[PDB]
Design a protein around this ligand. Sequence first.
Ligand SMILES: CC(=O)NS(=O)(=O)c1ccc([C@@H](C)NC(=O)c2cc(-c3ccccc3)nn2C)cc1
Ligand SMILES: CC(=O)NS(=O)(=O)c1ccc([C@@H](C)NC(=O)c2cc(-c3ccccc3)nn2C)cc1
Lengths: 302, 299
Amino acid sequence: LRKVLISDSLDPCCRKILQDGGLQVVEKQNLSKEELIAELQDCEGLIVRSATKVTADVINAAEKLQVVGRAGTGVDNVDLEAATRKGILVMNTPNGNSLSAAELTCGMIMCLARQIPQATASMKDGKWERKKFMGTELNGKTLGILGLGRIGREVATRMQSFGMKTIGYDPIISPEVSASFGVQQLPLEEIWPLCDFITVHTPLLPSTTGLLNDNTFAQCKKGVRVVNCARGGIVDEGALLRALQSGQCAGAALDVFTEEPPRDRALVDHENVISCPHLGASTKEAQSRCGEEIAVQFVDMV
Amino acid sequence: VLISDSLDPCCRKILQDGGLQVVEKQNLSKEELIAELQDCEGLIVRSATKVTADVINAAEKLQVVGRAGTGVDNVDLEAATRKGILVMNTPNGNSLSAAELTCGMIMCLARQIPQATASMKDGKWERKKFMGTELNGKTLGILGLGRIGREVATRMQSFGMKTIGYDPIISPEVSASFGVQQLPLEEIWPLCDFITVHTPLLPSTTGLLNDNTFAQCKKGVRVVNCARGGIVDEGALLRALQSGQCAGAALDVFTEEPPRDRALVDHENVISCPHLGASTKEAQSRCGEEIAVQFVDMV
Ligand SMILES: CC(=O)NS(=O)(=O)c1ccc([C@@H](C)NC(=O)c2cc(-c3ccccc3)nn2C)cc1
Ligand SMILES: CC(=O)NS(=O)(=O)c1ccc([C@@H](C)NC(=O)c2cc(-c3ccccc3)nn2C)cc1
């Protein structure tokens, strides 16, 4: 309404847009439970990234709190049940990270195709083992895109320029609409045996938990490569390890995990697995857009 | 024609349908190379067969030595030239693989996927460290606009990159047809966020990226060399990475292969590959086809 607190390291545009809207802004970081509660005592708004934990205790203590903004995707650090219970509106910026997640996904596909992380590691270990490496050309290969939201769409248009056949599935996006962005929709069971590469870009739901599992992996072409830059758990982690161990899956690229940081190291340590510490939204540009989009939403409210 | 190395079965197809008689077999010794090359005008090789001065001089009927790939380091060029033997290669067969790796490299420079992988493999979860940059809206300068240069251009245009470049052989109209606006070299350096080289290695291209050109670059330029070692002056690249003038470099090639000076390979902002630009089975098969076509073009 009048005072907003930013409790994580956000792009400076966020403060600027809120102040342009007429709001007072406090910019703090790495605050503990009581530190955050004290700052919030005169704030009607709170903007977080992922580090600040908007727990039940935080929500209940901040009496003037009306809105909780998340500069990004995934409101896991916010207690939605406690927020709904206190009449606090919860906002996020899903759109702001779209290009960054799509670019990383394409980066991962290329990394799997040419074993770039493994090659760099080999080189940094003072080795020159050309004969140990053999990559694959993306041109003429089939990329399966499960989830045809904005991220899935951006991935498709970039990989089409490589000469990849882009096929996929989304129960919301019609075959006519996907055709307009070059994605041929087929029923799931038809997708699995055709893909050389599979990339998942769906929200995490009961219907999408373990979408890639022992049964669907068995339906895949031998040597399939899997990319998960969406949500941990869409690709059943145990089933993936089994697929990598048998050779059913020739490689996997993971940005997300069921537990972050993952305590089970079997996937990360696998020689055919490349990974990142959830870097999908980690670009100067994505952070700027998220900061802007959350500040605009807060100004729209007042 | 004799095929001395492990090649695609389509090599024989084009050679035979062209009218020539072929002999295959691989893993042939020094004397097994002196003999067997008895009565054929042509010889087709890859990387394993080392076409040395001794082999060349022993085969008096030899007129052409074909290489299924780029780079004739395994062929004694001086020795073939002495006997009047033509040495041909297939750089076009490797075009797609080299362009694909380059694009992979650009992506790795913006997001540091190889470094993030290594960090993850050491049990680390370093989010702040690997905060990257978006390719959309960035300028990619492409120096050398042959088939590799143009293939890189069209792929990176789908990422919303502004593709500029220079090639003294390629006309501004030809480059404009694949969305590359040509500008003189001195105008390219201050505009780029990323610079990638796809030129042959010649005195005109040796050290094309040097201390002077790096000082003309925008602070934090990311550099890619998937062409030939020496195009980017390695000493100048290291100075640029040290000051921060260059924020990162992706190298598939080195002046010396393997590189003995590990300072670039060991830099945290450098990603590298042991010359994998042509290391796909698809490039190998295509090179196999292209060299057979060239041998058939004898008339
Ligand atoms: C911006 C951005 O794309 N965000 S996002 O979270 O990736 C994203 C992805 C997709 C959508 C819409 C188009 N689709 C769904 O919500 C959807 C897809 C699936 C599904 C099930 C099984 C197999 C494949 C797909 N089930 N559902 C409910 C919205 C957001
Ligand atoms: C298939 C494939 O593309 N091979 S390739 O080796 O990349 C390749 C690259 C380019 C070409 C032709 C088109 N261009 C040249 O030969 C050229 C470019 C330059 C130059 C000098 C300074 C700055 C920028 C450019 N000088 N020369 C002599 C042929 C092959």
